[PDB]
Design a protein around this ligand. Structure first.
Ligand SMILES: [Mg+2]
Ligand SMILES: [Mg+2]
Ligand SMILES: [Mg+2]
Ligand SMILES: [Mg+2]
Ligand SMILES: [Mg+2]
Ligand SMILES: [Mg+2]
Ligand SMILES: [Mg+2]
Ligand SMILES: [Mg+2]
Ligand SMILES: [Mg+2]
Ligand SMILES: [Mg+2]
Ligand SMILES: [Mg+2]
Ligand SMILES: [Mg+2]
Ligand SMILES: [Mg+2]
Ligand SMILES: [Mg+2]
Ligand SMILES: [Mg+2]
Ligand SMILES: [Mg+2]
Ligand SMILES: [Mg+2]
Ligand SMILES: [Mg+2]
Ligand SMILES: [Mg+2]
Ligand SMILES: [Mg+2]
Ligand SMILES: [Mg+2]
Ligand SMILES: [Mg+2]
Ligand SMILES: [Mg+2]
Ligand SMILES: [Mg+2]
Ligand SMILES: [Mg+2]
Ligand SMILES: [Mg+2]
Ligand SMILES: [Mg+2]
Ligand SMILES: [Mg+2]
Ligand SMILES: [Mg+2]
Ligand SMILES: [Mg+2]
Ligand SMILES: [Mg+2]
Ligand SMILES: [Mg+2]
Ligand SMILES: [Mg+2]
Ligand SMILES: [Mg+2]
Ligand SMILES: [Mg+2]
Ligand SMILES: [Mg+2]
Ligand SMILES: [Mg+2]
Ligand SMILES: [Mg+2]
Ligand SMILES: [Mg+2]
Lengths: 109, 386
RNA sequence: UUUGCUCCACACAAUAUAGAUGGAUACGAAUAAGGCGUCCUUGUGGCGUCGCUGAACCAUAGCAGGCUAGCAACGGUGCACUUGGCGGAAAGGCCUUGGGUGCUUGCUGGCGAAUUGCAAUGUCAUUUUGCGUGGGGAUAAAUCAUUUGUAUACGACUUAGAUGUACAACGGGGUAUUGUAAGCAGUAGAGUAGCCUUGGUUACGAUCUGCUGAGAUUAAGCCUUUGUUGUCUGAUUUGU
RNA sequence: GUGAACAGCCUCUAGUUGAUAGAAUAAUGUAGAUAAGGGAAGUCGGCAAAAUAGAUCCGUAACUUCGGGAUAAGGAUUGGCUCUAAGGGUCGACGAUCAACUU
RNA sequence: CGUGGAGGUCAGUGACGAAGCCUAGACCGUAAGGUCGGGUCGAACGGCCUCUAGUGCAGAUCUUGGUGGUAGUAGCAAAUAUUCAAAUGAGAACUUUGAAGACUGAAGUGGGGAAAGGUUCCACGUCAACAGCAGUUGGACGUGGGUUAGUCGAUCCUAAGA
RNA sequence: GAAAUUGUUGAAAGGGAAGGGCAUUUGAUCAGA
């Protein structure tokens, strides 16, 4: 939990957005994805790829996909302050279907 | 001036205050009157409300329009694995009421009941009862001395029992510990029964029998803060009402210059302790008994568990008590079932019920099939499987 | 735990006192009846006696009670032990065994006291706390934070979490909802418009049929899990 | 574009993305809705809400100032697709060619 | 008894500290009040005999000014809606850029004008105050630049009228 | 550089107001001889 690692996960955005107000569904999905990455990688500093934001907002504010396949990379950052020297960076995986996929270690990048 | 039209008051003033119960396990405030000629037996049992189903039975009620005819009745299933006896408490009578004189615990206590003494179990050193267990060092002289005190005193004897919550599908993992009065006299042999049952389980079939009328003591389902309209059943104000209509219009006369306790006010609804009486046991089902939900007329080898499991509860793998009707509390909640405090002979009690069929269709929807085999027989072969 | 906690003994400090200044000295019941003693044939018995208040009983003499010499008798009393029993209504007290030891004013002596100056409470009790010196004993939790939803406005409540029948995220299965997905194919299709091997073929064609009770969703407060991946010592506080 | 339409709804050019925010989802509210069976029994009073609604065809009473009432009342139909028919211009009874919708 | 001012007097007090103010510190008077000590302070002031008055406050929904409890409370909820990354910066929900999602939907949230405003236009610097959160941004603050006519208007004509 | 009002420190008290009168206890403080 103290080194760099990249894994691909499926997030069930449907059950996290269940009953959420329509005007808040996509922002809530963004926050739920940040919470998901924090839970899995132990990093408070979660950064979302703009392509991932595009994938979240692809079908409008309330048309968030039920499942999103994400690549999360826990990488180390060096800046003015340490401030959680490890951070997670989340990307979309761009698969045809986000169903029936398990968590996998990418192990190469 | 007078009310100008009579109506009964809204709500029952004997169930005040409508506050949250102090504990999730409702207290047994009265045990059955002791009959000291009977054998020593428990007067109550601890279980977990699993859910409701429906049954069909032949009504035996001469003079009724439905005598010797089939009736469909709602029933509640309480999962009741055997409870483990881990202690005995002695109660002496005093001019100031009953008073516990001493409690004698079992030598070994399982982690299930040990968790009950810990707010943070995972990070504790689990020291509970570690020095007490040494009272059983060679001959248990201190334990025998305390039991002798209980025999020499303590006109009322209660055992400490705890649930085997690990046998339920609940995630709680922390057992419920309660005092159950021992009826069946000779306080000496009450204590002897408790000591001989130390660390041993007591099955629900040794306490309750088929057709017996029992009482359910449980904390009702909580609903948070509630307005007067649903909390008390007061009349909704007309549509024209400014400042809201889900209210009580007059909360009091000018004098007394105070809101009176008897006026309906908005507040907490539910999560109250309730002791509802006269629920007939329709089944005393056994956990190891496959075809639990089967009857002498059905014979379908099926358990009491509805298809897909009890909604929000899980599967019944232990002994269960099926009572007629409904009982206070929601699914997964600890409920204490106690013997009736009086002898009911109204021909509603003393009726011997024989179940003809037990619904095991899914409660997760409009269930159509009792068993997966019946679903296969009706539907034929599907593409995925079957 | 910048040597922590508790108990005991002692010393020293504080701290106050709803108010010590010989002893709260134990049947029960009745009162137009009883207590005590005694006797017998043991009773709702006989006999005697008592009350008319505790104005009693016990205790009570000694530099706030010293130091010593005896006599008499194995008594009284305190102390610390010790044998055992009884007492649970708030028992925390009552009774009892044995020896040791101090006093004894039961009786007879010797020594001392003064000047606190003619009185000044003239300080003698117990309530907690702290500290130091020795001895004895033990070696946890709670809360915040995270989590659960049997709970909930917020507090609160109910759960879980230091290596496991653990938990979580996915995945699988069950359950349930809807109603037959996309794609492909078709001697299906009301037909219209072209071509010729005039029994076919080309273009368009709502829709229909088969793969297909398929496809999609399914806990967000459904059930379950021989799978995959990961998580599991951060903060604060609490002592008789 | 739909549509009779400068209606409502969606879009192009142009412009804006400005209203203090975050977390939960109690009561009571404000606004929007649904509701078994009954159908104004509520209430001063059908207040509020619901029901009706466009277009085509049929049919339309009392009364009347003969103009109306009248959309009286009361009924039927409406999608998609493939066709059919009718309704024209120009050039020299027809031929050639061109063209747009309405029924 | 006390206050502002006046005549006389104590050759009164005082920068070695007047007046004022603070002071569960002391003294005197039944009291109005008077006196003293200590602290603060800095330029005038007092006792007595008289004179004089714009001379004594708890109030008047008194006047002016200042300040509370309420109270970190009511609330900052109409106009569909924001999100991701980068840059800048001490600091970014609000600035800029890019990407995305939306809206006004031509009777516009578009492009110009009349009345009115008067520099709000634009650039640079810049955030103490204002923008009822914020702010690096602004119709803010500071410094400057900018409005070019024979043909567009006024000017000329007459209208109701003056 | 007053008061209202406020912060900190110190002291004290506080079972549904507070404040006051007579009297004394206790604590603090102090004049006179
Ligand atoms: Mg909802
Ligand atoms: Mg009446
Ligand atoms: Mg009800
Ligand atoms: Mg009104
Ligand atoms: Mg159901
Ligand atoms: Mg048109
Ligand atoms: Mg209805
Ligand atoms: Mg209906
Ligand atoms: Mg009707
Ligand atoms: Mg009516
Ligand atoms: Mg009526
Ligand atoms: Mg009427
Ligand atoms: Mg109306
Ligand atoms: Mg009509
Ligand atoms: Mg009419
Ligand atoms: Mg003057
Ligand atoms: Mg001075
Ligand atoms: Mg003062
Ligand atoms: Mg000066
Ligand atoms: Mg005046
Ligand atoms: Mg005044
Ligand atoms: Mg006055
Ligand atoms: Mg005033
Ligand atoms: Mg004022
Ligand atoms: Mg507020
Ligand atoms: Mg508002
Ligand atoms: Mg708005
Ligand atoms: Mg904003
Ligand atoms: Mg932008
Ligand atoms: Mg609109
Ligand atoms: Mg639009
Ligand atoms: Mg500008
Ligand atoms: Mg502001
Ligand atoms: Mg600011
Ligand atoms: Mg400027
Ligand atoms: Mg001109
Ligand atoms: Mg100054
Ligand atoms: Mg002040
Ligand atoms: Mg109070």
């Amino acid at each position: 939990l103290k080194d760099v690692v990249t894994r691909e996960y499926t997030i069930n955005l449907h059950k996290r957005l269940h009953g959420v107000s329509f005007k808040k569904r996509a922002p809530r999905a963004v926050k739920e994805i940040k919470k998901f990455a924090k839970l899995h990688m132990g990093t408070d500093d979660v950064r979302l790829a703009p392509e991932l934001n595009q994938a979240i907002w692809k079908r409008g504010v309330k048309g968030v996909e039920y499942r999103l396949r994400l690549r999360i990379s826990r990488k180390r950052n060096e800046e003015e302050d340490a401030k959680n020297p490890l951070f997670s960076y989340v990307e979309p995986v761009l698969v045809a279907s986000a169903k029936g996929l398990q968590t996998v270690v990418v192990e190469e990048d | 001036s007078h009310r100008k039209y009579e109506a009964p008051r809204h709500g029952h003033l004997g169930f005040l205050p409508r506050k949250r119960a102090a504990s999730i396990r409702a207290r047994v405030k009265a045990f059955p009157k002791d009959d000291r000629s009977k054998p020593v037996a428990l007067t109550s049992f601890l279980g977990y409300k699993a859910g409701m189903t429906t049954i069909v039975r032949d009504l035996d009620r001469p003079g009724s329009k439905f005598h010797k005819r089939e009736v469909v009745e709602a029933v509640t299933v309480v999962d009741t694995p055997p409870v483990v006896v881990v202690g005995v408490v002695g109660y002496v009578e005093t001019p100031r009421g009953l008073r516990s004189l001493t409690t004698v615990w079992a030598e070994h206590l399982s982690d299930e009941v040990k968790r009950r003494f810990y707010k943070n179990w995972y990070k504790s050193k689990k020291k509970a009862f570690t020095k007490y267990s040494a009272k059983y060092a060679q001959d248990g002289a201190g334990i025998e001395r305390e039991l002798a005190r209980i025999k020499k005193y303590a006109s009322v004897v209660r055992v400490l029992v705890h649930t085997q919550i690990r046998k339920t599908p609940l995630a709680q993992k922390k057992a419920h510990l309660a005092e159950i009065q021992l009826n069946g006299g000779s306080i000496s042999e009450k204590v002897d029964w408790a000591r001989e049952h130390f660390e041993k389980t007591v099955a629900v079939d040794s306490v309750f029998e088929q057709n017996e009328m029992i009482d359910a003591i449980a904390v009702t389902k909580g609903h948070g803060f509630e307005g007067v309209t649903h909390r008390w059943g007061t009349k909704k104000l007309p549509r024209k009402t400014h400042r809201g209509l889900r209210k009580v219009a007059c909360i009091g006369a000018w004098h007394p210059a105070h809101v009176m306790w008897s006026v309906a006010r908005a507040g907490q609804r539910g999560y109250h302790s309730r002791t509802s009486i006269n629920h007939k046991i329709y089944r005393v089902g056994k956990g190891d008994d496959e075809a639990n939900g089967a009857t002498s007329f059905d014979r379908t080898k099926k358990t009491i568990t509805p298809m897909g499991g009890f909604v929000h509860y899980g599967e019944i793998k232990n002994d269960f008590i099926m009572v007629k009707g409904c009982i206070p509390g929601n699914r997964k909640r600890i409920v204490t079932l106690r013997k009736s405090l009086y002898t009911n002979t109204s021909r509603k009690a003393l009726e011997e019920v024989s179940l003809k069929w037990i619904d095991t269709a899914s409660k997760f929807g409009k269930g159509r099939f009792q068993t997966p085999a019946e679903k296969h027989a009706f539907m034929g072969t599907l593409k995925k499987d079957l």
